[PDB]
């Protein structure tokens, strides 16, 4: 009120809102998988000269089922990360599957050195395929040594970007550290090139109820209280909307059930007090709020009373009748009295009277009293004009 003294009465103040209690994430589980399990784990790969090129689309690039593997030493992308692949949708993914010398794993990486690398796998200048190094010595190993995976490709003509060494007798487990055969697996994917048809996986957490929590269900993020609901969703309808076309009910993705959404309590707050010099004892009211949550943010209370218009704190209830002094709502009114304290009560609409009706007696006045009363009415206010410019 921008004043050091305030008149007796009720005055609106800053509202109140129940802040969230915690966050909850509920989602379905690992869904269909893109043909990646085969590319990063298989019994046999394609030949080095016949380096595999598999187009992948119309599936889910589920990085969860792929990253659950612990055999990887360093699996991170220079521009992205697998962890944040839950909410990334791919257009098409190219899978390159071939068996080469172990020392040639990095030579498959872009920006490498060596004329023996482009002989069997040319290095394009705009390769976004993240490099992956993993052990495949057992898979690529043969007892006598497999020489079939030769690098005889020695074409003299320059190799264009994706237009289509032999220091070991064969792929043998006896090869030393860094020399054992390695299966180079790269998820070479491009965006903005083909229509979006591949989307990522999701993650879930535990469930809670009867708490102001930030719930995320199937990408629907919102804060509220989750309570079991008896509403019967259809087998395919996962949520419902009110006449206001606003989500009100949500079906759990993991378990099959229906839950409500109830935004946690909030409402205005106001103060009731006598004049400043009158006293320094105040009453706080929470319109449309319950004392169930008033200890959230005077949290002790010690004098609380429920009311249809909210729950009052710091005031004393009275079961007597008096004329309304400071209205509260629902026929409730406050006054300051005796020691002195603020009190609330049911307003006294007026002193009861009952005329002695007999339709046979008549009350005729004996005399009168002339009275003078004031009436005040505005008739005008000060004029006004302005230069727009």
């Amino acid at each position: 009120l921008k004043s050091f003294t305030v008149e007796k009465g009720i005055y609106q103040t800053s509202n109140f809102r129940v802040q969230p209690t915690e966050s909850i994430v509920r989602f379905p589980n690992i869904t269909n998988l893109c043909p990646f399990g085969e590319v990063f784990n298989a019994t046999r790969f394609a030949s080095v000269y016949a380096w595999n090129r598999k187009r992948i689309s119309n599936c889910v690039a589920d990085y969860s089922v792929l990253y659950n593997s612990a055999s990887f030493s360093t699996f991170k992308c220079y521009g992205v990360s697998p962890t944040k692949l839950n909410d990334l949708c791919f257009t098409n993914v190219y899978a390159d599957s071939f068996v080469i010398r172990g020392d040639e794993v990095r030579q498959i990486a872009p920006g490498q050195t060596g004329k023996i690398a482009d002989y069997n796998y040319k290095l394009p200048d705009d390769f976004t395929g993240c490099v992956i190094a993993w052990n495949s010595n057992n898979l690529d190993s043969k007892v006598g040594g497999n020489y079939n995976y030769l690098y005889r490709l020695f074409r003299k003509s320059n190799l264009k970007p994706f237009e289509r060494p032999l220091q070991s007798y064969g792929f043998q487990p006896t090869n030393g550290v860094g020399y054992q055969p390695y299966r180079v697996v790269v998820l070479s994917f491009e965006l903005l090139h083909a229509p979006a048809t591949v989307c990522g996986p999701k993650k879930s957490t535990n469930l809670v109820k009867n708490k102001c929590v930030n719930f995320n269900f199937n990408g629907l993020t919102g804060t509220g209280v989750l309570t079991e609901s008896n509403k019967k969703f259809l087998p395919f309808q996962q949520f419902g909307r009110d006449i206001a076309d606003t989500t009100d009910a949500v079906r759990d993705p993991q378990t099959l059930e229906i839950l409500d959404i109830t935004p946690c309590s909030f409402g205005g707050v106001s103060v009731i007090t006598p004049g400043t010099n009158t006293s320094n004892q105040v009453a706080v009211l929470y319109q449309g709020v319950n004392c169930t949550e008033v200890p959230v943010a005077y949290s002790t209370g010690s004098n609380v009373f429920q009311t249809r218009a909210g729950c009052l704190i710091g005031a004393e209830h009275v079961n007597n009748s008096y004329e309304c002094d400071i209205p509260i709502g629902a026929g409730i009114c406050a006054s300051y009295q005796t020691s002195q304290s603020i009190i609330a009560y049911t307003m006294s609409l007026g002193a009861e009277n009952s005329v002695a009706y007999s339709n046979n007696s008549i009350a005729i006045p004996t005399n009168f009293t002339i009275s003078v009363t004031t009436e005040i009415l505005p008739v005008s206010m000060t004029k006004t004009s302005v230069d727009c410019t």
């Binding site: 006449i243 606003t246 449309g288 218009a309 609409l349 009861e352 009706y357 339709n359 046979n360």
Partner: protein, 367 residues
């Protein structure tokens, strides 16, 4: 909350603009206070509280259906409960939309109207001027007959018939309001207007207003501060304009509502607390009294009126000559269907012998 709740970006960007919310707070608060006040004037016009006596010996006039019945938990009239049932229609809270209950309670309004009707029937029109003074209802009706310039004698001469006609009329209005519902169209329309305004206000939340989307959370997640702002300011702009529009037509509707409330208060204080003379103000026909009944957010008046029904015309003369002097009626009018001449009150066919006391002299005949 309504515009961009739950966002520090919302808070700071709204702070950029200024004090529009600040003003609109009082804008709506004055409206709420005005509603409460209007209720105060229209209903709480009595210093004390009165209660009907147990003996309902109102000269055979039946007061009951309007009167309270102790049996029901809500001490409303039969008719008032019927109206409550007739009138008919809370998911909008989600965006800070809050409804403040009326300071009073339907129960309080019911008690007020009960006391009003009791005082009226018991003390005529005196309670308004001051302390209620007991009177016989028959005496009050005689005074009303005088007020419409009707001789009291007829009232008693047809007390029973008048009572029966009143009973039939009250029953007929009961049945009519019970059957049809179109009478409550005004209140139904008011409620529907309010509901539709709020509903549309909610609907506006879904508009992008030229933004990429109408989900501030999606904008925040997808975009970084600069273009997130580029979209958010636009959304704020659109929602802002929608809100001022709403506040405006709320202002205008409240203004006209206040005018109607003042009219209703005047009607109360004039038709009910007394017998006025403004033609058609207290309903069609010659006004006698009225009886209020509370309704959700509204009031109902039962205007009681006299109406002539049958006619029997005659031949008249401006005045009469007896001894070369002009005699004129003090009140009423002369009348003759031939055979004889008489004088009678204008508003009822009550022929009477013309004599000295009936008339008065003025001048001679020729003029």
């Amino acid at each position: 909350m309504y515009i961009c709740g739950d966002s520090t970006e919302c808070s700071n960007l709204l702070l950029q603009y200024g004090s529009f919310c600040t003003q609109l707070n009082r804008a709506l608060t004055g409206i709420a206070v005005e509603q409460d006040k209007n209720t105060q004037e229209v209903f709480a016009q009595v210093k004390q509280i009165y209660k009907t006596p147990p003996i309902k010996d109102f000269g055979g006039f039946n007061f009951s259906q309007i009167l309270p019945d102790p049996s029901k938990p809500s001490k409303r009239s039969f008719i008032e409960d019927l109206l409550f049932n007739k009138v008919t229609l809370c998911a909008q809270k989600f965006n800070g939309l809050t409804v403040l209950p009326p300071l009073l309670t339907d129960e309080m309004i019911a008690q007020y109207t009960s006391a009003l009707l009791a005082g009226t029937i018991t003390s005529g029109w005196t309670f308004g001027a001051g302390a209620a003074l007991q009177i016989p209802f028959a005496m009050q009706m005689a005074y009303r007959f005088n007020g419409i310039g009707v001789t009291q004698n007829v009232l008693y001469e047809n007390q029973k018939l008048i009572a029966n006609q009143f009973n039939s009329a009250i029953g007929k209005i009961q049945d009519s309001l019970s059957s049809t519902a179109s009478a409550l169209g005004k209140l139904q329309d008011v409620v529907n207007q309010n509901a539709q305004a709020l509903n549309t206000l909610v609907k506006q939340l879904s508009s992008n207003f030229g933004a990429i989307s109408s989900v501030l959370n999606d904008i925040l997640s997808r975009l970084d501060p600069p273009e997130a702002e580029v979209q958010i300011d636009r959304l704020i702009t659109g929602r802002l304009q929608s809100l001022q529009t709403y506040v405006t037509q709320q202002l205008i509707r409240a203004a006209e509502i206040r005018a109607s409330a003042n009219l209703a208060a005047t009607k109360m204080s004039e038709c009910v607390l007394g017998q006025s003379k403004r033609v058609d103000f207290c309903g069609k026909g010659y006004h006698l009294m009225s009886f209020p009944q509370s309704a959700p957010h509204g009031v109902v008046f039962l205007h009681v009126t006299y109406v002539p029904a049958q006619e029997k015309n005659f031949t008249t003369a401006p005045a009469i000559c007896h001894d070369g002097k002009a005699h004129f009626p003090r009140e009423g009018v002369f009348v003759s269907n031939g055979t004889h001449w008489f004088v009678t009150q204008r508003n009822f066919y009550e022929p009477q012998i013309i004599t000295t006391d009936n008339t008065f002299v003025s001048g001679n005949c020729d003029v």
